[PDB]
Amino acid sequence: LPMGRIVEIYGPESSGKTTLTLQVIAAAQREGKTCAFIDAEHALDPIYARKLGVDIDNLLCSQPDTGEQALEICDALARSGAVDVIVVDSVAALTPKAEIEGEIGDSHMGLAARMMSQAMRKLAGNLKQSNTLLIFINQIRMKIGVMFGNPETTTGGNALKFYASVRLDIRRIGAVKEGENVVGSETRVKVVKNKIAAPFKQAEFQILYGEGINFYGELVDLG
Amino acid sequence: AIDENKQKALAAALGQIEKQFGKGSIMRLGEDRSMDVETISTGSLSLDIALGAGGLPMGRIVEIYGPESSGKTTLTLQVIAAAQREGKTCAFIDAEHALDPIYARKLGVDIDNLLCSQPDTGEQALEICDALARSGAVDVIVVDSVAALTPKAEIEGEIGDSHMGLAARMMSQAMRKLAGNLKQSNTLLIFINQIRMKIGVMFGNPETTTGGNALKFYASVRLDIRRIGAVKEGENVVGSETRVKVVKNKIAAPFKQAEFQILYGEGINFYGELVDLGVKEKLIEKAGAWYSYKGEKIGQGKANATAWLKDNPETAKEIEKKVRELLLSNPNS
DNA sequence: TTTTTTTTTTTTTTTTTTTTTTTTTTT
DNA sequence: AAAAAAAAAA
Ligand SMILES: Nc1ncnc2c1ncn2[C@@H]1O[C@H](COP(=O)(O)OP(=O)(O)OP(O)(O)=S)[C@@H](O)[C@H]1O
Ligand SMILES: Nc1ncnc2c1ncn2[C@@H]1O[C@H](COP(=O)(O)OP(=O)(O)OP(O)(O)=S)[C@@H](O)[C@H]1O
Ligand SMILES: [Mg+2]
Ligand SMILES: [Mg+2]
Numbered sequence: 001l002p003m004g005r006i007v008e009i010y011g012p013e014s015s016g017k018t019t020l021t022l023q024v025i026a027a028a029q030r031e032g033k034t035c036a037f038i039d040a041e042h043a044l045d046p047i048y049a050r051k052l053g054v055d056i057d058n059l060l061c062s063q064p065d066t067g068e069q070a071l072e073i074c075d076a077l078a079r080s081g082a083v084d085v086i087v088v089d090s091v092a093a094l095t096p097k098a099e100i101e102g103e104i105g106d107s108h109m110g111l112a113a114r115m116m117s118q119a120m121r122k123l124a125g126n127l128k129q130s131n132t133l134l135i136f137i138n139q140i141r142m143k144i145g146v147m148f149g150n151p152e153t154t155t156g157g158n159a160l161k162f163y164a165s166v167r168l169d170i171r172r173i174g175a176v177k178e179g180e181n182v183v184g185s186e187t188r189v190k191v192v193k194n195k196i197a198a199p200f201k202q203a204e205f206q207i208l209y210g211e212g213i214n215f216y217g218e219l220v221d222l223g
Numbered sequence: 224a225i226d227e228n229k230q231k232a233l234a235a236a237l238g239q240i241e242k243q244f245g246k247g248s249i250m251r252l253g254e255d256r257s258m259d260v261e262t263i264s265t266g267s268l269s270l271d272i273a274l275g276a277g278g279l280p281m282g283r284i285v286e287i288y289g290p291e292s293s294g295k296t297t298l299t300l301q302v303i304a305a306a307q308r309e310g311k312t313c314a315f316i317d318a319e320h321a322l323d324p325i326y327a328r329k330l331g332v333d334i335d336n337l338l339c340s341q342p343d344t345g346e347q348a349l350e351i352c353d354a355l356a357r358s359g360a361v362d363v364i365v366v367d368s369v370a371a372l373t374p375k376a377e378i379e380g381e382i383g384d385s386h387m388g389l390a391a392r393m394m395s396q397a398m399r400k401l402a403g404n405l406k407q408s409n410t411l412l413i414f415i416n417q418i419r420m421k422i423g424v425m426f427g428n429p430e431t432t433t434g435g436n437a438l439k440f441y442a443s444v445r446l447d448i449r450r451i452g453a454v455k456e457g458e459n460v461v462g463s464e465t466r467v468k469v470v471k472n473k474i475a476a477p478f479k480q481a482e483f484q485i486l487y488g489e490g491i492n493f494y495g496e497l498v499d500l501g502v503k504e505k506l507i508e509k510a511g512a513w514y515s516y517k518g519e520k521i522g523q524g525k526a527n528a529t530a531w532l533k534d535n536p537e538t539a540k541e542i543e544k545k546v547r548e549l550l551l552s553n554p555n556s
Numbered sequence: 557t558t559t560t561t562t563t564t565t566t567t568t569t570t571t572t573t574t575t576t577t578t579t580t581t582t583t
Numbered sequence: 584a585a586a587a588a589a590a591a592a593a
């Protein structure tokens with residue numbers, strides 16, 4: 001993954017989005033780099049992060065109240081020049097202040113898409129100067145009034161698709177069994193956008209519950 | 224020399240963030256105690272083992288779904304009863320308009336202290352959940368059927384009028400607003416969901432759940448409950464044989480399952496589980512259809528062995544203690 | 557040869573920004 | 584296989 005750029009990772013429920021993103025952090029911390037995790041979903045388990053190989057004691061973590069606060073912390077850490085990797089867990093949970101103060105049922109027409117469009121404009125330049133990698137996790141939603149193409153879409157509007165240097169589609173394609181005991185997931189990643197090399201290549205690997213990505217399993221298949 | 228200017232730049236940035244947004248706005252993950260996972264009992268010992276962390280996680284969202292008369296409401300009332308016995312406050316949002324308070328009392332719920340609402344719209348139901356979460360004074364909220372959370376525009380409208388993804392949009396907005404508030408208050412939110420069949424499919428599961436896709440993403444636990452048979456007293460059907468599958472888990476390994484009995488008017492059969500678990504850990508010897516503890520022949524047939532454990536509380540406590548110590552991945556005492 | 561006096565009055569616009577979400581058997 | 588309605592900023 002390229003330093004100083006924006007990356008998007010999206011997929012369905014329990015496809016391994018958070019697990020993949022913690023393995024990037026673990027690998028970067030072993031090379032002396034500093035990392036931050038913005039947990040907008042409010043669902044990070046620190047003991048699981050430790051089992052995957054993250055140094056919990058040095059990882060900066062924030063659970064912000066609004067989307068604006070989340071993206072202002074990203075800008076501040078990027079300008080500092082001292083953080084190498086930032087992860088933002090779900091764009092889908094980046095709630096605008098006006099929507100939090102409001103009531104359930106109130107319409108907020110394209111307010112989240114407008115905030116995201118503003119954030120990309122402000123961040124792209126700062127990330128490139130600091131040489132900081134920013135990873136956005138995104139969730140999938142269905143679009144209505146469609147027969148062509150894919151009815152699948154992502155959250156947060158159109159800006160992120162333009163500014164991302166790499167976009168990754170992750171999917172669970174089966175179970176890893178020890179006879180009866182389900183012990184992990186068979187996983188496929190498609191590269192759907194690439195600006196640093198050719199796109200549309202794919203990768204297959206195993207995620208084992210409590211260990212993470214099965215390295216030696218890949219080394220067999222490649223050997 | 225160069226890594227020392229970085230430490231200073233980082234310290235300044237952390238200072239500026241904490242000044243702008245408040246004290247605990249950014250910290251190191253290892254020194255954040257609010258981020259530790261705390262669990263409460265489900266009222267079933269086999270399900271507490273299947274979940275891996277010894278129960279359902281406080282501060283998170285949980286989904287329980289299944290077919291008609293599978294025990295969804297009964298399971299949530301057993302969670303509330305177990306929580307009330309630890310001095311926690313509990314609320315029940317009855318969107319189905321089908322709760323019986325006499326039956327709730329028989330399952331062990333304190334009817335006099337349980338908060339209850341029968342809201343008119345889905346928006347009203349989800350605004351009450353948000354208000355109780357912000358209060359900081361409620362520990363467990365149950366919402367009976369997502370399926371019955373009707374948007375205001377659909378109630379004011381006529382039967383036949385199309386409302387394209389209006390319910391799905393309301394749930395997507397509710398998750399965004401609630402997730403953060405539930406974590407700050409340390410409140411557990413349980414959603415009950417119904418199964419619907421999907422058309423235009425040949426592969427996979429044609430079974431779907433109601434209310435759109437948002438809840439699948441934000442839930443920390445998802446439970447599929449199913450009636451697998453009858454519990455008989457010769458002729459009289461006295462209860463249900465029940466299976467729960469953990470189809471999503473973020474606090475331990477998923478895809479474990481639990482089997483137990485629901486007896487009509489009592490609820491979940493605790494001693495019936497404790498027999499089957501004590502047998503599995505070699506603390507109870509099973510000689511064909513005979514149950515024996517430490518050589519002492521206690522009963523023949525599961526029902527008599529359960530009745531024996533009932534009238535001897537101390538030996539039941541001894542077997543519980545052992546099963547708890549052994550099989551739980553994270554014992555908390 | 558000798559010696560200054562005193563203010564008056566407004567003028568005129570410029571330019572958009574951004575999506576969100578499924579629903580249900582039928583024989 | 585056929586569908587709908589939502590605002591606020593220098
Ligand atoms: N603490 C844990 N212990 C054991 N297994 C886990 C844990 N957390 C996640 N997993 C499993 O790892 C697999 C991938 O999980 P994640 O990386 O959390 O996926 P995800 O796409 O981020 O899912 P979300 O955010 O919940 S929609 C799933 O099968 C999980 O059940
Ligand atoms: N008041 C009651 N007295 C005796 N048995 C009951 C009572 N209420 C429910 N039951 C039985 O307990 C079992 C589980 O019922 P529930 O817990 O209501 O299941 P459920 O999935 O909530 O079903 P729904 O909401 O009707 S689709 C069923 O066999 C019921 O008949
Ligand atoms: Mg995740
Ligand atoms: Mg019910």
